[PDB]
Design a protein around this ligand. Sequence first.
Ligand SMILES: Cc1cc2nc3c(=O)[nH]c(=O)nc-3n(C[C@H](O)[C@H](O)[C@H](O)COP(=O)(O)OP(=O)(O)OC[C@H]3O[C@@H](n4cnc5c(N)ncnc54)[C@H](O)[C@@H]3O)c2cc1C
Length: 262
Amino acid sequence: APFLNPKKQKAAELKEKIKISHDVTLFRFGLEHDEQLLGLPTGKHMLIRKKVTEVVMRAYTPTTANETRGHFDLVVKIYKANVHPKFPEGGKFSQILEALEVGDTVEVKGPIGHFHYDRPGHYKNHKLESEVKRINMIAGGTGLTPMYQVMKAILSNPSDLTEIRLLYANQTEADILLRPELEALAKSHPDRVKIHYTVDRPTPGWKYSSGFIDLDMCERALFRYEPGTISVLCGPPPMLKFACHPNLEKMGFEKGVTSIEF
Ligand SMILES: Cc1cc2nc3c(=O)[nH]c(=O)nc-3n(C[C@H](O)[C@H](O)[C@H](O)COP(=O)(O)OP(=O)(O)OC[C@H]3O[C@@H](n4cnc5c(N)ncnc54)[C@H](O)[C@@H]3O)c2cc1C
């Protein structure tokens, strides 16, 4: 019996809270028992909530999935107060999570989502089903973890030959999430995945792209459309609508059919 039940809010207890960097924390939440299946299909996420002094809820794709029993890990960017001048109050739920102590609980509802990569080289999107050979992934900031979950499900499977191209955009090089992990995946599956990065404001020793995602960047980093090739996207709404879809549409993709948003 899996932990996730889409009809229920299920309590999960914080087991470990481990700093990845000054503003990125890994939260390790226990399931009902240490051998329990999470029950999160590839392509889906969860809603995590807590009642504080007001019920606050946000979507998260854990960096672990069904392969890890008894717990799930969340990698969370903490949007701290009095750091950014445009956002002096910071992020509501990421600070709630950061303030948690081991032993505190959150409520979890899931699985959530319309896209399901259900078996090697195959997916379901709402009511539509199809074989797939190549997947483009475009992520911005925290939009990375839905991509990371799919990349691991494909690359760690000894019977899946699906190829991947990731294009990951962030404001600064310091904002890139899971960079060592992404680099280690590209290093350990060199003929199956490529990863390309862009930052708004780069430093002199930067070996990748600068500025917003454009047609040239999409053509360098991603596959063009052919039957069997899809593009999946997760990031800030303006980035997707204005920088991604127009350029994928020029590369032969179709919004909602071959270009799918998480
Ligand atoms: C499918 C899915 C999966 C996700 N997975 C993850 C994941 O694994 N990890 C993760 O960290 N997030 C993930 N997110 C994002 C998550 O849902 C939240 O939006 C995020 O945690 C921020 O919420 P918040 O309550 O802290 O910020 P809010 O209070 O909702 O603030 C709104 C926005 O203000 C901006 N902002 C506020 N303060 C600052 C600041 N100090 N500096 C810069 N910008 C600021 C941010 O862009 C923020 O998103 C995912 C989202 C989706 C839809």
